[PDB]
Ligand binder design. Structure first.
Ligand SMILES: Cc1cc2nc3c(=O)[nH]c(=O)nc-3n(C[C@@H](O)[C@@H](O)[C@@H](O)COP(=O)(O)OP(=O)(O)OC[C@H]3O[C@@H](n4cnc5c(N)ncnc54)[C@H](O)[C@@H]3O)c2cc1C
Ligand code: HEM
Ligand code: HEM
Ligand code: HEM
Ligand code: HEM
Ligand SMILES: O=C(O)/C=C/C(=O)O
Ligand code: NA
Length: 568
């Protein structure tokens, strides 16, 4: 058989998968996936028949209900969604090699005749608010506009929810929380503001940082009121005190928060459509939003009539060509992002008249696993790990800013470095057991053997750790002046992870005011158009602090949702 449908029609009718009139139920393929599930079992039942020791196509930490048609198309060969970041050994029937080629919003100009036909038809739905993107900002806004009495449609162009927010590990920054107080942490919104400005080089828009800092406690209480666990409070670089909140025992912040938001959306019956891309914000004759034209991967173009459009489409860090244009130094770097984080929501914003700002500031995360090509949380260094070069020495304050840490790493022999830590750090941060499970953290009971394994000078490494621990115990890092030295590296076994920088976050984007209203180049509000999260510029300045993006998405998403509901 050349495809999965042809295979199944050797013993089945067309309607063992399709509805009675045979039309596609919707762009989520609800009815159709349900048929796959009714013969093959749910996603968990199917994982039992495809186990591998260290991985499984049908089991992943992705939140939400992952549709079988996310990877299995019926009438054509398709691609495994895990291959946009890993290379596991899979043998999916009717597979084809992972290759994302999504047209730009500009190349979508060519569909002049379908667009026109769709815009001359009646709107397909008429609601109060349309939310574009199912990352943190997008679900938060959908929920808060709904809890504000507005009817919402939430759309996601990918087949799965969560964007890059489902990958967050380190934590969500917040200050002066009840979680921090119970952890005997002393902080204030003023220290977080101050760490943020300093952190972004005083380029950040101060009114936005003030919203960021002043609403962060509330953003954490909101999430916690909806069911999240954000009681573990750790440190990341450029913070004065520990203020990165995440689940108990240091598990990832991302997948958990996106799972809480999805559950909350679901309880409210929020209309969520997958495989549905926002293409053009529609405006009336007085330049205010009247709706949006969308492109359903399965049922074509159609428009949603609405008073308000919230753009929560995240960044363009996956887009190395745009990234290279703005920063030539990042050309050819690997990236930590999901495959559709390419900037198309920015094009929608501009075409709508929104102006952009800070676009030249692109953050490279300092520690991507060379072996796995995936981000290794900075909470690994925050909970105590050190960085050593191939000569087995420390070479940088490990909890310095991302810019500095990336530069020191690229300057080392081989252009990479090694995270080094023990079982006390491991046990303090459960996330580390994910990297051990990926095969990216070799271990040994002595630094002498660990260094032999990885090409690190063994005796040098042993004396480096011994010096570090003595620096921990005396309380001052007089070598590199790391300001927080939480743990001696002396328990149980040792572990090394080889790390190198990757494109990670774009601090510039659509220009928003304090109510998340998109403005033009004159700084005039575009009525009905809002912007929230990494698609916006001005929050993070020239350099974002680890932990500040999940705080930003919850805060600015919530608020845009509320403001869009009021506006109407
Ligand atoms: C690997 C990794 C670890 C990180 N760790 C942390 C952490 O620990 N703490 C922290 O503070 N930050 C962290 N960050 C940053 C990060 O989580 C965020 O910057 C990011 O998720 C912002 O969320 P968002 O909702 O704004 O966008 P996203 O979560 O990226 O969601 C955007 C969504 O919009 C959809 N979309 C885009 N364009 C369109 C369109 N035209 N139509 C319909 N849908 C569209 C995208 O497909 C996507 O699902 C981490 C980032 C990553 C990638
Ligand atoms: C799009 C929807 C579905 C998906 C993604 C899916 C998935 C799959 C895949 C990946 C295969 C392997 C084919 C090969 O080996 O070449 C398969 C085979 C099979 N499917 Fe489906 N399926 C779907 C719908 C259904 C339905 C509706 C039925 C029954 C009416 C069904 C019953 C079977 C059977 C009997 C086989 C052969 C082996 C077996 O499972 O006993 N499938 N399916
Ligand atoms: C001869 C039998 C069948 C006929 C005539 C048929 C017809 C179609 C048509 C016409 C479309 C495209 C519609 C559009 O673009 O609006 C389609 C898509 C689809 N069909 Fe079928 N179908 C048949 C069998 C099946 C079977 C057996 C399955 C599942 C195993 C299936 C699952 C799907 C899915 C999931 C889609 C969406 C696109 C895709 O994955 O290719 N179909 N079908
Ligand atoms: C309930 C939803 C799904 C069903 C019913 C389904 C069905 C199946 C079946 C029946 C097989 C072959 C089983 C066998 O040969 O024993 C298979 C293989 C596979 N499917 Fe799925 N699938 C689903 C969802 C997904 C998703 C969401 C992904 C990707 C993220 C995926 C990726 C794969 C891969 C990679 C293989 C080959 C497995 C390997 O080599 O380990 N499937 N699927
Ligand atoms: C169904 C699809 C996928 C599967 C089955 C899968 C499987 C895994 C596995 C087995 C691990 C090691 C952790 C563990 O032992 O559970 C892992 C780690 C990781 N994968 Fe995936 N992966 C998938 C898709 C993706 C995609 C698309 C990305 C990025 C967009 C991604 C990013 C990561 C990250 C960042 C980690 C590191 C550990 C963590 O951050 O929790 N994965 N994945
Ligand atoms: O967990 C991390 O390394 C990243 C956090 C961030 O980008 O804020
Ligand atoms: Na941005």
């Amino acid at each position: 058989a050349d495809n999965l449908a042809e295979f199944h029609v050797q013993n089945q009718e067309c309607d063992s998968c399709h509805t009675p009139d045979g039309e596609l139920s919707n762009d989520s393929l609800t009815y159709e996936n349900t048929q796959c599930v009714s013969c093959h079992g749910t996603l968990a039942e199917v994982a039992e028949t495809t186990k591998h020791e260290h991985y499984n196509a049908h089991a992943s930490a992705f939140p939400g209900e992952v549709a079988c048609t996310s990877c299995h198309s019926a009438h054509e060969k398709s691609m495994v969604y895990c291959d946009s970041c890993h290379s596991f050994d899979f043998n999916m029937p009717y597979a084809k090699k992972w290759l994302r080629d999504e047209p730009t919003i500009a190349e979508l100009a060519k569909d002049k005749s379908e667009r026109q036909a769709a815009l001359a038809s009646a709107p397909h739905d008429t609601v109060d608010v349309v939310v574009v993107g199912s990352g943190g900002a997008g679900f938060s806004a959908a929920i808060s506009a709904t809890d504000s009495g507005a009817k919402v449609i939430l759309i996601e162009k990918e087949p799965v929810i969560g964007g890059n927010a489902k990958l967050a590990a380190g934590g969500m920054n917040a200050a002066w929380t009840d979680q921090q107080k119970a952890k005997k942490i002393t902080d204030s919104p003023e220290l977080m503001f101050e760490d943020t400005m300093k952190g972004g080089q005083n380029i950040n828009d101060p009114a936005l940082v003030k919203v960021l800092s002043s609403h962060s406690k509330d953003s954490v209480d909101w999430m916690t009121a909806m069911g999240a666990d954000l009681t573990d409070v750790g440190m990341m670089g450029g913070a004065s005190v520990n203020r990165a909140h995440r689940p108990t025992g240091g598990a990832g912040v991302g997948a958990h928060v996106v799972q809480v938001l999805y559950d909350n959306a679901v309880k409210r019956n929020i209309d969520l459509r997958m495989n549905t891309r926002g293409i053009e914000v529609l405006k009336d004759d007085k330049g205010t939003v009247k709706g949006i034209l969308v492109k359903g991967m399965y049922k074509g173009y159609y428009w949603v009539k609405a008073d308000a459009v919230i753009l929560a489409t995240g960044g363009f860090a996956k887009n190395n060509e745009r990234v290279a244009k703005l920063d030539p130094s990042l050309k050819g770097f690997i990236s930590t992002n999901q495959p559709g984080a390419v900037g198309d929501g920015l094009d929608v914003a501009e075409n709508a008249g929104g102006a952009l700002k800070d676009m030249q500031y692109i953050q490279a995360h300092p520690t991507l696993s060379v072996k796995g090509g995936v981000m290794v949380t900075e909470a690994v260094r925050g909970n105590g790990a050190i960085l050593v070069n191939r000569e087995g020495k420390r070479f940088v304050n490990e909890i310095t800013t991302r810019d500095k840490a990336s530069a020191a790493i690229l300057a080392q022999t081989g252009k990479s470095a090694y995270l080094i830590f023990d079982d006390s750090v491991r046990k303090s941060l459960s996330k580390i057991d994910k990297y051990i499970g990926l095969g990216v953290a070799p271990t040994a009971d002595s630094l002498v053997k660990l260094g032999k394994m990885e090409g690190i000078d063994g005796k040098a490494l042993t004396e480096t750790v011994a010096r570090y621990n003595s620096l921990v115990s005396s309380g001052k890092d007089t070598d590199f002046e790391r300001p927080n030295l939480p743990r001696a590296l002396n328990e149980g076994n040792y572990y090394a992870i080889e790390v190198t920088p990757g494109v990670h976050h774009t601090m510039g984007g659509v220009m928003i005011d304090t109510k998340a209203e998109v403005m033009n180049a004159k700084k005039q509000v575009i009525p009905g158009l809002y912007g929230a999260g990494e698609v916006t510029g001005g929050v993070h300045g020239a350099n974002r602090l680890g932990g500040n993006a999940i705080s930003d998405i919850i805060t600015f998403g919530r608020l845009a949702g509320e403001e869009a509901a009021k506006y109407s």
